[model samples]
Every structure is written in structure tokens, then in C-alpha cells.
Target: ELISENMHMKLYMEGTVNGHHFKCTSEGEGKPYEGTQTAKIKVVEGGPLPFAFDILATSFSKTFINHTQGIPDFFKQSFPEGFTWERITTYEDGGVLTATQDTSLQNGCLIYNVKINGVNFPSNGPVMQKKTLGWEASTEMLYPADSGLRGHSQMALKLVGGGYLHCSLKTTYRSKKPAKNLKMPGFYFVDRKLERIKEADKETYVEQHEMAVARYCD
Candidate 1:
């Protein structure tokens, strides 16, 4: 039993709803959304692993597309399609992984639903329509308390410990942006300035932040 660990999967979204000059005031709070890590995979964990995703977000908004939800793309589609992000999945025993968002918005809006390690993300989108996004999975294995593989610190291991195998999914359906001649399903920030305040939440925001070196031969 030997396993070096570091797993990641992120897809974030920002806020704002109800248009005109791409302004905010639904109490305004949703900005910062950008994504990377195009695609890179390698794993082993069988059965029930036929993942698929289209997680919609296109209720209008795109001078070229770049909505500021806390600073990232926050699912504000249209620009090459929301800062080039397409967060996806992986699985094995402890078997389970599913997603079935029933679409809408005609133009866009539908967010979050999915959680693992923390719980809740094994989904099935009934006919609820605009409330789709779910997640679930775990076998448990964590270690990231500033881990460099315990470079030094006596580097102990006899019955050590591990943690941090997570996949927290989400969902949303918002409106904000419209004044290119007013239409709706908001979003339009090309050279930037479609502001919506409130920012402070950034960690391991990956796009190819790769790390691997699980060494501890017994």
C-alpha cells in the first residue's frame, strides 16, 4: 500500500443579476471567475466512471465574454467561452460519479450542486429544470499542510496520515448585464470593467499546477 497524493478539480463562478450598462444591484456581490488547467489525466479507480458535463451558463453576456465574479470567470459564459475553463472528473471503488443538468435560460443562468469529501454530489436532475449541479465521491486520503513531503521535520512515517481528496461541485442561475441596447441574460466585459465588488478567495487555482512525487517505499 503506497500512494503519493495530490488531486484537484475546480470550476468556480461569480455574481450579479438584473441588467443595464452591465451594472449590479441585487445587493451586488459576484465577481472574479477565470479558469485554466485545460486537461491532464492519469488514474486508476474502476466501475461507474462514464462522466459527462455541459454545465450550462449562457444567458447573454459577451463583448467577447469575461464576467468578473470575485475576479474569475464564475461561469459567465461567452468568450472563447468564459476564460477557457472546463472543469471535469475521475473515479474508482467507493464507486460513484454522475451529472445530469436539465438545461434552460434560452440565453443563460444555472449554477452549483455537487460535493465530495465534504459530501453531496452524486446527482440526478429530475424535472426540476433550473436547479441542477451535484457531486459525490471518496475513499479518503489527505496531506497538504504545506506539504513538500515533509522535506525535513525529522520526516516521520511509521503509521503516518493522509487527507484531502475532494471534489466540491456547484450550480447557479443569475442575471446582470444589458445595455448594448437592452436585451437581458447579462454579461459584457472585454477589455475589462463589468465590476461587481467582493473578492477574496483564491487557493490552488490551477490550470496545470501539477505536482507528483509520492516516494516512501516500504
Candidate 2:
């Protein structure tokens, strides 16, 4: 039985797409993980969108070793750019969502920097087409920052006792054309006109990182 000694998981999708930049990030140090992501992560159907990027999640396991040098090579081998994709699993409550977390009592969290492309979202669901969009929805569904599911919210904390992940994917898309039948559930439908392109050429992306620590899934 995969168990949660003390842990949770997090995902941040940032970068640029077609020139528009954005930072869709979320985590809560003192609150529930579910509540935070749904409340904070935002998607722009018309401004900045990501075609591909990566998200770093605090892996579900930890080590008593005091330095990064001590991390198990097996874990490293698990996701060294697709050797097996085995060592790291998603957030589950009573089965495969296995993980462990012992903070200062331990040295560090085993982390995996997973890639989110045009069609894969292993942190929660299957490989998705329009992968970035699928990833956003995956984050909303799999591991939010302040969900009220108790220990289950922390991928670092539970395997089978917590709620089967919670969600309330936001309502984005400007009313300026703000609604449509979304082909997918991650980013919504909306439209907006821009005069700014006449002003500034695209230069950067969001990469909005809030200083970590203190959240349910940091």
C-alpha cells in the first residue's frame, strides 16, 4: 500500500506561445492545494498561450540523506528524459499515487521535471493532444494547492485514503467573445482584440514562480 507520511505535489506551466507570454502558477503553504490552484491558475484564450513547456513537481518520495548527492540513482534513472517513466507516478489516494515526505526531518523531496508538450500529461491523465491545454486541466484536476481533501491533497502525504483529487477549473476567456464549446476542459473559450501588438513586439514569457515552501504542495 503506497502511503503518505507527509507530502503533496505541485505543477507550474509557464512560458510563451505564438508571442503572448503568461505565468499560470499556484501553491499554498498553509492552506489546501486544491483550493489554491483553482483560485490562482489562469488561462488566456486570446493572449499568451503555451504550446510546450515543463513542470517541476515535488516527487512523492523523500530521503533521510542530507545532501542532493544522496538521491537514489534508481529514481534518477526513472525519469532521465524517458528511460522508463516508472519511478514517478501521479497523485492517487488509495493505490498507485505512492510517495513520502519528511521535511527538515529529512533532506529533500525527490522531484521530477516532467515535460508537457502538445500531447502528454502523465501527472494525471493520458497523453493529450493540445498537450499544454491538457496539462493545465491535469493540474486543475490532479494536484491543486488548497483542496479540502485532507491528507489526500498532498501527493507527498497520501496514496489511498484521500479524496480522488478535487477540481473546479476556472472560467477564463474574455466576454469580448468569452464563450464557446471547448474542445477540451483545461483552458476555456474566449476572444479579445489587441492594439498592443502595434505598440510592443513580444519579448518574454510569464514563468511566474512564487517563492516555494509553506504550501500544501510546494
Candidate 3:
């Protein structure tokens, strides 16, 4: 009956990346509630975009007692029995784009990590036209095993001529959810490389449209 004990949530989003269309949908369910999140990147005429992702337990537990002493007193008093939540929501869409949730409430601490794994093109192009090109971009999230609320993002891709583009970002915060009419704090990174591939070799990269950049929450 308290804020920490009873809550329901759902999140959905739609947008474009480098002219490509994408959508992410999710819903929360089960005891302590969990999410089943799905995302997609559309292609013009061929296969769905080429991408895949996985959610793993870097560190987790079933007993709330494990985090008691380290968590805030408020959280300890509120969730004395501890919490009954596991891995984040996950949706499997043939690997085009995969999403995972990481939510935890410990002694005075709340941490959430949304992880994605997939590939797109090195260049942001008109999604409606590059249905036959190969993908050359890579992006991933690196989470800290033991720490405060924070997330690190890294991206890499091939340059058009003959080089590589890479970028990384780190975001830290004190709250899991924001208050009254305030935008959630976040950090992001982006990079690209453009190189000419043999016209005939384009078919070798047969994949759907590519997608980059997103926001997921509930």
C-alpha cells in the first residue's frame, strides 16, 4: 500500500535514427513486476535490420537481506522483506534489436541499466532506400558491478574512406525516477565512419534498415 510496495507501469516510444524509423514497446507484469520490452528497425524491401542483444546478470540476488546494511534506511524500512524482482523486461525479435532491463533496490540505492546490442550502417541514410546494404556500426553498454547509480555507453563504426569512429559517455545520478515536471537526467554518445565498399559487395551486407539512439523507461 506504500509507494515502494504497490506500483504499475508501461512504456512505449517511436522515433527515427538517421532517417530510419524505429519503435520500442514494453509492459510490466508478474510479482514485483517485470517488463517485456521489444524494439524494431524497419527496412525498405529486404530482411529486417541486422542486430541482436542479450540481458545478463552481472550481479543479482533473491534475498533482500544481502543488501540491507548498504541500502538507505528509508529503503530498508520500506522493503524490509526485501524486493522480489529479477532481470529487466526482454523481447526477442529475431535479433533485429534486443532490449533488457536492470532494476534493483538495495540499502539506500536504486540502479537501473537498459542494455542493447545490434548493428546498423556507418552512415545515417534514408532507411527506405538502403535495404540491401551491409551494416558496419557497433554499440554497447558497460555497467559497473558495484557502484552508485550510473551508466556508460560506447559506440564504434567504420569511416567512409578508411578509418574508424568511436565515442563513449558516462552518466551518474542520485535518483531512479524524477520528480514533478522535470526531465530525467541522462547522457549519450554517437560516432560514425564512412567508407566506400564495392558496389557489388553491398549485397554481401544484406540486412535491414539500421537504428541508433533511444530512450527506455517506465
Which candidate wins on TM-score? 3
Give the deviation of candidate 3 from the true structure as CA RMSD.
Answer: 14.6
Worst 10 residues of 3 by lDDT: 53-62
Q: Per-residue lDDT for 1-218 in model 1, tens only?
A: 01012112222222211110111111111212321112111211221122221111121111122233322322233211221211222221121222222211222322222222201223332101113222211111112122100111111111113322233322122223222322222222223221112222121111112111111111
- TM-score of candidate 2 against the unseen true structure: 0.20
- Point out where model 2 deviates above 4 Å: 1-6, 28-218
Evaluate model 3: give its lDDT: 0.28
Candidate 3 residue-wise lDDT, 95-171, digit = tens: 12223444454343333334333224334322223322222554323222222234454433333455434334343
Cα RMSD, model 1: 20.7
lDDT of 2 by residue, 1-218 (tens): 01123333333444332233444443212112112211122332323332222222322121111112222222112221211121223422211322222112112222222222121233333111113211222221212122110112222221233323322212111111112311211211111111111111121222222211121222
lDDT of each: 0.20, 0.22, 0.28
The list of candidate 3 runs beyond 4 A from truth reads: 1-7, 30-68, 73-149, 152-169, 174-218
Query: How well does each candidate superpose onto the true structure, as a TM-score?
Result: 0.19, 0.20, 0.28
Task: Output the worst ten-in-a-row residue range by lDDT, candidate 2.
Answer: 190-199
Q: What is the Å distance of residue 123 in model 2 from its true position?
A: 28
Q: How much does candidate 3 score in TM-score?
A: 0.28
